[PDB]
Amino acid sequence: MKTVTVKNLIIGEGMPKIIVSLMGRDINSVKAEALAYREATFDILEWRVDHFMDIASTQSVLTAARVIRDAMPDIPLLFTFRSAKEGGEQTITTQHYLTLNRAAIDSGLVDMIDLELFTGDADVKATVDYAHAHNVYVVMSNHDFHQTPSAEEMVLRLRKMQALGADIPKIAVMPQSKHDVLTLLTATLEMQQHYADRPVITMSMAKEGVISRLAGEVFGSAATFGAVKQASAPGQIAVNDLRSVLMILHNA
Amino acid sequence: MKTVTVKNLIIGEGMPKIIVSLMGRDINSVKAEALAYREATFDILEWRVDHFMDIASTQSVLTAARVIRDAMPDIPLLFTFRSAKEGGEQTITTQHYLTLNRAAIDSGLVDMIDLELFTGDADVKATVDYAHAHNVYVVMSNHDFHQTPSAEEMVLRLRKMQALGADIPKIAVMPQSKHDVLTLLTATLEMQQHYADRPVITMSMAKEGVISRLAGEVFGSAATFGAVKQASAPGQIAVNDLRSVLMILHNA
Ligand SMILES: *[C@@]1(O)C[C@@H](C(=O)O)C[C@@H](O)[C@@H]1O
Ligand SMILES: *[C@@]1(O)C[C@@H](C(=O)O)C[C@@H](O)[C@@H]1O
């Protein structure tokens, strides 16, 4: 296991780390959210850039990043543009997606970026290399908002992210049955027991999948997402309740 | 599904019901525990009769039952002699075990009894019939403190309890790996999806199995055990923490 340490937070040891997502459509909204969010207790701040409407302007995006970092100078900050293809709010070109991510890396304002595995292997690998050259870690991600692949498929997908240089592979899948929630936990455990080179983040979405957001410590998900006021994906619960549960499990 | 209603508690609907176990070695200890326990919040009181040292005297046992019922007149009360064979504190003859259980049934003091499946089919069936004739429900139970059977084996075991007249089949198994915890959840879910005639109580014991004590509502365990001060089996957590988690899951 190669853990990932950002600002004295160690991802891949101990209790799963709590991530919340900041979703602001504009600069004033981001400012207000950053001020509210700094009164919540959590480990990593994810900025969901795809909710930001002025995405065409790299400098507008960087100005918003700076608002966030100034509000919270000591928080690990993950920059995530979630494409609509994978359940986010809007669509941009692959070239603009890579530009925004490289700009984020160059800014020194963010500690981690999210790169979607299915952006394409060559582009992902080159951007991973860029991030690493600039001391930024990569959460490499995949989402299936329709269904849950087989456990074997999910393991192979996470392994491929590892092969491409991901610091932290991530997969989120939509259950169509309670059995699908167990499949996701099965794949998670298989990584912990047999492919434990990198911390992984896994979740089964929606109400049915909520237990996957709580059981990270036993089956091997290194982080989990909670909601401050609004969920950034189906199934997230209130961040304070998430924290209560994690602590009870850790101390059981 | 045929639910079981005891004193306006419906077992097999809604949130899993919280059971705590009273373990007193003697009459004064039982008295003190009943007084402390009535200041805890839970749904069903289990009296672990096997911790009671004066087990040879049916009347001593009935006197202790009455202490409990007087302290808590409105609580569902489950009378459980757990044999040492299945992880309890002492051993008695099969005939004395059946005598104590029939005495409990006859007393009108208890709402439910526990009968161990492996006492023997004919004796179990006859005692189930006796309980039913006297308006007492049966939790039929099995414990494996060494290992976890296969999911198929656990389902067949629970189905056999149903066939013998159990109102509520119960199985507790010891994980030797995290995979074994998923096996127990798998068997639980199979009952909910395919053999949903009776509420079932399931658990994977020990620290590793704790998630099974929390996830009853999604995968289909109708009750879960918490500790007031001391656990009555490995893996139980503090009853207040158990309740916090159940409520968060129910409302997620
Ligand atoms: C990630 O895709 C996980 C999501 C979830 O909680 O299912 C939340 C997203 O904001 C995050 O990027
Ligand atoms: C049952 O055997 C379940 C046990 C557990 O919590 O694993 C507790 C016992 O007291 C009860 O009878």
Beta bridge partners of A136: none
Atom of ligand 1 nearest to the CA of A48: 10
How many domains, in total, are found in chain A?
1
Q: What are the structure tokens assigned to A161, written together?
A: 């992210």
Question: From CA B145, how far away is CA A222, in angstroms rounded?
Answer: 30
Question: Would you say B104 and B110 are in contact if contact means Cβ atoms under 8 Å apart?
Answer: yes
Residue B83 has a CB neighbour count (10 Å cut-off) of 18
Q: Which residues of A are catalytic?
A: 143, 170
Task: Name the strand (E) or helix (H) holding B79.
Answer: strand B77-80
Q: What are the structure tokens assigned to A160, written together?
A: 């491929």
Residue A44 has a CB neighbour count (10 Å cut-off) of 22
| Contacts of A32 by beta carbon, 8 Å cutoff, 6+ apart | A24
DSSP for B92-113, please give it: --HHHHHHHHHHHHHHT--SEE
Taking CB atoms within 8 Å and a gap of at least 24, the contacts of B51-60 are B51/B23, B51/B24, B51/B25, B51/B88, B51/B89, B52/B24, B52/B25, B52/B26, B53/B25, B53/B26, B54/B26, B54/B27, B55/B81, B55/B90, B55/B92, B55/B96, B55/B100, B56/B96, B58/B99, B58/B100, B58/B103, B60/B27
A47 is in an annotated binding site: yes
Nearest of B177, B184, B183 to residue A194 by alpha carbon: B177
CATH number at residue B185: 3.20.20.70
Question: Would you say A52 and A24 are in contact if contact means Cβ atoms under 8 Å apart?
Answer: yes
Going A212 to A213 to A214 to A220, the CA torsion angle's sign is positive
Q: Whose CA is nearest to atom 5 of ligand 1?
A: A233
- In single-letter form, the type of residue at position A95 comes to Q
Under 8 Å CB pairs connecting chains A and B tally to: 62
Domain ranges, residue A49:
1-252
Cα separation values, A196 from A168, B24, B251, Å: 11, 46, 34
Task: Name the strand (E) or helix (H) holding B141.
Answer: strand B137-144
With 0-12 / 13-18 / 19 or more C-beta atoms within 10 angstroms meaning exposed / middle / buried, residue A32 is middle
- In single-letter form, the type of residue at position B130 comes to Y
Q: What are the structure tokens assigned to B90, written together?
A: 């002492």
Residue A105 has a CB neighbour count (10 Å cut-off) of 22
A153 is in an annotated binding site: no
Cα separation values, A131 from A79, A166, B188, Å: 12, 10, 45
Strand-strand pairing, A4-6 and A9-11: antiparallel
Chain B residues whose CB is inside 8 A of the A217 CB are none
Question: Would you say A223 and A18 are in contact if contact means Cβ atoms under 8 Å apart?
Answer: yes
Helix runs in B72-209, H state only: 94-107, 121-133, 151-163, 178-194
Q: Do A249 and B211 touch (CB under 8 A)?
A: yes
